[PDB]
Design a protein around this ligand. Structure first.
Ligand SMILES: [Fe+3]
Length: 309
């Protein structure tokens, strides 16, 4: 027996997982690598004739479009019902294998946890004037903006974007260069995905930055996910569920958090010290239907209006 996986996750991350899975399970996994968004397009075109059994991506927008297209199988309750709500489809069509949240990174030499405010909306103020990075072409940032739209509407969102632009931010290619820029002294603050600082702290356990959250429920604490789902078209749902349940087993979770630096979705996992406890994230995180992040074109439009793209 074998299954076919379409993976928006990189092979260097995935290969060790699937090989161990094959080893323990007996099931061959035939993987087709690619871009999360691109593989969702392909599935919609392929519709019911797709050979894929499992889809595993690293952005909720692409997954949300599949769910809306009616291409995803409802998972058994045994798979999803025990997971926290920020990590599961409302109606059980996908589950997070790992969490990729938004945080605020900050200089430990020119700032502290004190200077982090209650809301991401508060960063328009003067205290933050010329003290920020932005990476407005980063996927995680764009998905975060989509979420802000969902939560708050476009008007509030665009006022924030422009007010942020008008506060003299520095514009970076990615999160790595934003974190770098903190240690290098160009900026005191950045909004980033959570799994970047853990690499810096590896290479130099005294790197001069930490990352924290805003207040409970703030949209700036959004938890995106690497989501996984079974296709309706599949004729091998048992095997495909076994794969998913493997990915939620403690060994796999521990690997995601320790090797990849992403949050686990289950309890009983030894936390990366840079991230901290899962329980803290659950409190911090906002309640958002992640399937609503399918509207990227809307968000790009606003970014062009704000002049950030
Ligand atoms: Fe990335």
């Amino acid at each position: 027996q074998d299954i076919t996986l379409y993976s928006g996750r990189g092979e260097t991350l995935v290969k060790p997982i699937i090989e161990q899975f094959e080893k323990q399970s007996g099931i061959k996994v035939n993987v087709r690598y690619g871009d999360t968004a691109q593989l969702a397009v392909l599935l919609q075109e392929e519709g019911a004739r797709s050979p894929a059994d499992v889809y595993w991506g690293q952005d909720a927008g692409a997954m949300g479009a599949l769910a809306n297209a009616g291409l995803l199988a409802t998972l058994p309750e045994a798979v999803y019902k025990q997971l926290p709500e920020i990590y599961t489809s409302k109606t059980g069509q996908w589950v997070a294998a790992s969490g990729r949240s938004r945080v605020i990174a900050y200089s430990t030499e020119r700032a502290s946890a004190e200077d982090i405010p209650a809301s991401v909306f508060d960063l328009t103020s003067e205290k933050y004037q010329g003290r920020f990075g932005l990476a407005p072409t980063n996927g995680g940032f764009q998905s975060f903006v989509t979420a802000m739209r969902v939560q708050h509407g476009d008007e509030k969102t665009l006022a924030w974007l422009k007010a942020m632009k008008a506060n003299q931010p520095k514009i970076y290619r990615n999160n790595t260069t934003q974190i770098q820029a903190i240690g290098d002294g160009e900026i005191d603050f950045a909004l980033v995905n959570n799994y970047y600082l853990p690499r810096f702290v590896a290479a130099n356990a005294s790197f001069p930055a930490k990352q924290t959250y805003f207040a409970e429920g703030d949209i700036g604490n959004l938890v995106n996910v690497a989501g996984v789902a079974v296709l309706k078209s599949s004729k091998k749902q048992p095997q495909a569920i076994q794969f998913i349940e493997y990915m939620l087993s403690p060994a796999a979770q521990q690997y995601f958090t320790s090797v990849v630096g992403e949050y686990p979705v289950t309890q009983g996992i030894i936390p990366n010290p840079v991230l901290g406890e899962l329980d803290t994230l659950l409190q911090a995180a906002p309640s958002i239907d992640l399937d609503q992040l399918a509207d990227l074109q809307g968000t790009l439009k606003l970014l062009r209006d704000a002049g950030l793209l």
